[PDB]
Design an enzyme around this catalytic site. Sequence first.
Site, PDB file in Angstrom:
ATOM      1  N   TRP A  42       0.852  -1.175   0.000  1.00  0.00           N
ATOM      2  CA  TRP A  42       0.000   0.000   0.000  1.00  0.00           C
ATOM      3  C   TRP A  42       0.896   1.236   0.000  1.00  0.00           C
ATOM      4  O   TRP A  42       1.390   1.637  -1.054  1.00  0.00           O
ATOM      5  CB  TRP A  42      -1.138  -0.038   1.055  1.00  0.00           C
ATOM      6  N   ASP A  43       1.074   1.883   1.136  1.00  0.00           N
ATOM      7  CA  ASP A  43       1.803   3.140   1.160  1.00  0.00           C
ATOM      8  C   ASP A  43       3.205   2.947   0.567  1.00  0.00           C
ATOM      9  O   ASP A  43       3.927   2.018   0.958  1.00  0.00           O
ATOM     10  CB  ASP A  43       2.001   3.492   2.640  1.00  0.00           C
ATOM     11  N   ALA A 129       4.459   3.948   8.165  1.00  0.00           N
ATOM     12  CA  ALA A 129       5.123   4.659   7.054  1.00  0.00           C
ATOM     13  C   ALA A 129       6.188   5.660   7.511  1.00  0.00           C
ATOM     14  O   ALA A 129       6.211   6.129   8.657  1.00  0.00           O
ATOM     15  CB  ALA A 129       4.096   5.400   6.191  1.00  0.00           C
ATOM     16  N   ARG A 199       2.401   9.877  13.506  1.00  0.00           N
ATOM     17  CA  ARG A 199       3.124   8.957  12.616  1.00  0.00           C
ATOM     18  C   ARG A 199       3.630   9.710  11.386  1.00  0.00           C
ATOM     19  O   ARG A 199       3.311  10.885  11.218  1.00  0.00           O
ATOM     20  CB  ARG A 199       2.202   7.812  12.116  1.00  0.00           C
ATOM     21  N   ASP A 200       4.415   8.993  10.537  1.00  0.00           N
ATOM     22  CA  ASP A 200       4.705   9.377   9.140  1.00  0.00           C
ATOM     23  C   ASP A 200       5.744  10.507   9.042  1.00  0.00           C
ATOM     24  O   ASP A 200       5.485  11.612   8.537  1.00  0.00           O
ATOM     25  CB  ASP A 200       3.441   9.814   8.368  1.00  0.00           C
ATOM     26  N   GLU A 284      -2.667  12.867   6.979  1.00  0.00           N
ATOM     27  CA  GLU A 284      -1.642  11.825   6.995  1.00  0.00           C
ATOM     28  C   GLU A 284      -0.535  12.098   5.957  1.00  0.00           C
ATOM     29  O   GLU A 284      -0.685  12.941   5.076  1.00  0.00           O
ATOM     30  CB  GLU A 284      -2.194  10.425   6.684  1.00  0.00           C
TER      31      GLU A 284
END
Lengths: 412, 412
Positions: A42-43, A129, A199-200, A284
């Site tokens: 996915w990501d 991620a 996150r990220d 995100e």
Amino acid sequence: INYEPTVWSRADALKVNENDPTTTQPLVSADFPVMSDTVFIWDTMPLRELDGTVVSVNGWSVILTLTADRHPDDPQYLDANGRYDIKRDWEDRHGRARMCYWYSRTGKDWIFGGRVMAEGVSPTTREWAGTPILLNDKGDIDLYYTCVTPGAAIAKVRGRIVTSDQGVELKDFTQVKKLFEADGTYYQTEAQNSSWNFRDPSPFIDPNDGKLYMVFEGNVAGERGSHTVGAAELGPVPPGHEDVGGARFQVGCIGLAVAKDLSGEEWEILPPLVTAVGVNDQTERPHYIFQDGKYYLFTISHKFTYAEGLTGPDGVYGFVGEHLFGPYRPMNASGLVLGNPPEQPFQTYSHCVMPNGLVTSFIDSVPTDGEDYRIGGTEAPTVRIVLKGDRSFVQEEYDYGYIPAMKDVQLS
Amino acid sequence: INYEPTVWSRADALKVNENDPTTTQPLVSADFPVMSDTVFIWDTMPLRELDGTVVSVNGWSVILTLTADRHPDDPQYLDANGRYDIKRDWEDRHGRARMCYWYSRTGKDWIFGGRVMAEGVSPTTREWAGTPILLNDKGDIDLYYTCVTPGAAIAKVRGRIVTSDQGVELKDFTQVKKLFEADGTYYQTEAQNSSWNFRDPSPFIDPNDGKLYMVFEGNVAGERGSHTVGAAELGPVPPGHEDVGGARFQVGCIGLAVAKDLSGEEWEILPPLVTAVGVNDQTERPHYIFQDGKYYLFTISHKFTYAEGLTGPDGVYGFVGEHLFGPYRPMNASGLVLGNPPEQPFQTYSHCVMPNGLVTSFIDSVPTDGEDYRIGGTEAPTVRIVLKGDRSFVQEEYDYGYIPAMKDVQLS
């Protein structure tokens, strides 16, 4: 730094147009190819430099993906009629997420390289991620990523890439260092909200001051339910739009942190740059493009994380300004840069905009026939956007998963 | 001056959203009142100063209107069933247009003052739109207006206002001077296009250089049918939007001219400021607001004057910049500032945005029942907009025809 955040207000979000052909993702064909029949991806995170340039190494393009196995023959996914429950397997990917790499001489038709980190290296079993950074022409890489459950921390792990005529290997990613977690004064904690977002990491060297910074997804600190949707958050809404219902429960923000030096070993958190209280809970995978003297800050969000009384598509949103610390303006007036088409509202997600204007995303759910649909877990067609001042415009489409190198680095 | 114009491109116009509640005119009730049962009014022009301030004189608000008689008992408008053909009478107003004034102590419930100019003073029988300027506290007024048929010229006529406890009189408007007409190199002529547009002077003192200028409606010069819709005019349209059909026949622009001194006796034309070749043929009644260090240039346009392949509402559009000579950016990304609601697409027209944020317009056609509708020829509810950077937001609505004074001038 003590700057005030840019607010993305409810009145801005009332301008979102899901039917604008300059900001709509091209339709994905239900006959799409799949890049692996053993793993979902996915990501996707291209190998890049700190200035944003997507790089090949010795002529090999390299991408990282969040990845989980496909289980088409596992009894736990076969129903009473012996049908494979691909929807459940796909939905279970998050708890099994691991970082894998792929390589190609062409920027497409990716060859699977396998895990970046051996099992057990990551402090958490889930590897979520971030960004892989090529540090130098010796092939040193810092991978910035998110360790989740228990808790959520932004972390990094150093390794290296080597290549040959046969392919690429990433190795020596053996020591993860956690860098920081939500603090509770700027960014919301698990204690304040069991569903907190943190996150990220997306690190970069600032073009104006030469320091190392990163943006990341956060939520505005405070106990869940306590946030104020006041005049700034509502913005100048039209008559009839003054009731916000439960909008205080949506508190997404783009966070910023600064490295204490260029090693990026130790970091200081800074106050949120863009806040969406009363508008959307999720901003995100934030990331920058630096073009034409401006900072273009992109972030992805969902239809289903909007606050009551607003509507918008899954896709990528953006804010633009001339100064890292703001103020920023919403792209295209509403903030929307590329939204899924309302006929296929969940076809793609996790848009990553690269400085050549190409945008990569993965295929999620594409309708087929009746109320029926096909699950992707593979790359979508890349599409180019162009940026013109505070506006963007979708342009032509490219092959599935096309992520060409902007520059080649020859290893020393 | 030799500046390049700002182009409003087809790709910009593809962003127009007729369904955005922050840029939609509130619905007009079919039970609206009418301000006169002997005359129709339409384009309304508040008395103002050259800096944009709408003024009262000795406590009296004053507006000018284009005006024509109603003929409910004239045989030429009674059909074979003895019904009054109000649609035909309303449509015939343009050829009978004359400048009248109205006054009020409250900014509404206007009292009819009658003709500004005696019949035969105007070089053309039709007196079309412009701006009345209060020059000083002695009550001298310059009325800038459009003389049409034969030809089209921007003109001015000097007069004066006097008041008493009983009301207002405008008088001594006896000598019209034509100032300029379309030239053929910057602005299109009748010879180049029998349907050429050239009208609607809006004079102002520039806040930065202190000179007297005016904007007006023009068309880009050249033989009808010869204009190029090239890369700049198309802009970055999405795939599938490359065919422009007969778009070259739409060539609207906002023109600019500069007075050779502050008397505004003699003028020099300057090149177009904003051009809409391949987008819309009509950018009518242009006017400025000067706010927050910016120039906001508004203009009104129609659904039916868009080029092939584009769609948008009747209403007011705008462009914003920091320098009189540009470049400008389209307001709200598409250019649309206030559009009619798609359920009542012709309810109002001729929006005039005043520096207090209030917008006046007149009522045109409001649906009633079935395919049936009511003709207005009277003022619509005033609505406030707020401007925030390059975006606008509709706010609350006010009474029919409410045009309050921003400043009162006491005559000396």
